[PDB]
């Protein structure tokens, strides 16, 4: 038993990290077969960066301006084209580390694992989810510019989330692996702000079903409720609407644990109005919501990958 | 900015992890050079574990009793010898991706990494800390034997536990490389317990001064104390003592933020007369007590490894 924020094992990714230079900028990139993505606004400087023109910028540039670093290796850039917010250099060399792999674009609510580097060289390893106004509460200094988040099926390694840039509230924001936002944000230096995040009810309902499955029982009730009912106790407090899609993927975890969906609904219900009163859930003392109803049933039966 | 509890990246552990199977047990060990390592209690069955002579037991088997996977490879067992509570078992093959390595054994209050395995593949990887009873709060299921936890400096890894058992409050033991335990838990099935736990006091400080370092400032106050008198009111909260080794441990720390180490102590002492009332500390509703004044100062730094 136990339970903790556990992230995917991160070797596959390490193996496709390399640094990328051109004139006073640094940042990371992800060598995957004979291709290395990047964030395009390397080619910026400290003054481009107020309002640039990629394209006219691009344009001013040859292969050898491109500085690639793997290890003490250097690789050289033999083209460049730009998709939306990403640099694509072709490079003369084949990674041979390259794993099975596929790029996605994923919805808000779900997690994944970020493997934060500075100059090609792996940090450290944790999990973040993507809140409903589309940013991420992540861990990110000078340089980090490139990091990647993944998830892992098997052997194959889902990349969802490439690093761009840092907002005024000290939460973060970036792109697919193909360039595109994840929210209303452009990368350019001027006033942009997050708008007002919301708990993701799904993930929370998750977590308690996680407790008990633990040994935490304390929070149930012989209550119940209805859907509309639930849900107009959780607009009050700012809570994300739950649909009958979400009930159904709670199924697993209902049969599992003899607690129908909406019997759980009455007891958050009551932790809302009431408080948790000095006690807490799975060492905590506030209502958690980064695990998926898929983070809990891997991790309380014991899936692993290869 | 942000600060996350961040495990260190798990590949060099990867790549030494294999399956170790003898009669109708199985679990993990882990290969460096041409040794695996692995828990002694492997050559015990459901009625052997109740009350075993390990001596008496191993005097019985041969070699090819053992069976070594790794990935579907087979390595065979030419030698083995038990030393304390671990089995070192010689195969004829060194492993081509034995990193640099040590074993050391830690002090309570250190922080480590755990990789999460089953059948010698990987899982997941999360933060763990040695608690002063010597426990961990872990995450582990049947078959997660042979796991183990680890830091990494630069290019060297260096492993510190090996997971042995689950206690009946929930919480985990086991030993060093060396086969030692940490506590006074031995591999048998009887009776044991943990011994009432304590809060990591030098630990909760650094983790105010990283929510200083990220904006956080709520919680100070204009007040002071002597170490003495924080120490009086710490033993009636179940904290641990403070030394003056620990004060000078956060050395580097007040002088990057400006606040004296016994002043962040009196503004512990407020929060712990006097709760939080309602507001949190880098995300959390509790003082925290697994970062180490370390951990505080790599995150916030930007420290990789190679
Ligand atoms: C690339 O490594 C950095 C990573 C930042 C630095 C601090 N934490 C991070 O995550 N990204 C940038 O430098 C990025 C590029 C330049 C300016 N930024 C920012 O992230 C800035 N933020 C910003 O302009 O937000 C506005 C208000 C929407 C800032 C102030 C943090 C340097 C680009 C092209 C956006
Ligand atoms: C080896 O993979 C398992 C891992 C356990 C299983 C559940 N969670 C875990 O961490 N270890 C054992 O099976 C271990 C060996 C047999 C009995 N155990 C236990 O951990 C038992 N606990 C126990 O006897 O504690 C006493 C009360 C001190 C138990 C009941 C969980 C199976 C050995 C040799 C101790």
């Not at 929210?183 to 702000?193: I, K, L, Y």
């Amino acid at each position: 038993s136990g339970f903790r924020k556990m992230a995917f094992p991160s070797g596959k990714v390490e193996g496709c990290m390399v640094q990328v230079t051109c004139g006073t900028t640094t940042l990371n990139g992800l060598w995957l077969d004979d291709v290395v993505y990047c964030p395009r606004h390397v080619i910026c400087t400290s003054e481009d960066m107020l309002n640039p023109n990629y394209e006219d910028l691009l344009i001013r540039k040859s292969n050898h301006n491109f500085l690639v670093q793997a290890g003490n290796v250097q690789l050289r850039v033999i083209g460049h084209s730009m998709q939306n917010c990403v640099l694509k250099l072709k490079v003369d060399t084949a990674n041979p580390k390259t794993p099975k792999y596929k790029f996605v674009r994923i919805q808000p609510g779900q997690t994944f694992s970020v493997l934060a580097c500075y100059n090609g060289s792996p940090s450290g390893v944790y999990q973040c989810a993507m809140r409903p106004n589309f940013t991420i509460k992540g861990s990110f200094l000078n340089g980090s510019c490139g990091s990647v988040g993944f998830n892992i099926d098997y052997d194959c390694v889902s990349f969802c989330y490439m690093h761009h840039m840092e907002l005024p509230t000290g939460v973060h924001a970036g792109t697919d692996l193909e360039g595109n936002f994840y929210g209303p944000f452009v990368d350019r230096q001027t006033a942009q702000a997050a708008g007002t995040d919301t708990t993701i009810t799904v993930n929370v309902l998750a977590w308690l079903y996680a407790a008990v499955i633990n040994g935490d029982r304390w929070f149930l009730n012989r209550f119940t409720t209805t859907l509309n009912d639930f849900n107009l106790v959780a607009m009050k407090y700012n809570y994300e609407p739950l649909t009958q899609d979400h009930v159904d993927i709670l199924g697993p975890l209902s049969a599992q644990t003899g607690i129908a969906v909406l019997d759980m609904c009455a007891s958050l219900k009551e932790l809302l109005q009431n408080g948790m009163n000095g006690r807490t859930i799975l060492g905590s003392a506030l209502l958690e919501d980064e695990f998926t109803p898929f983070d809990v049933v891997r991790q309380c039966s014991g899936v692993t990958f290869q």
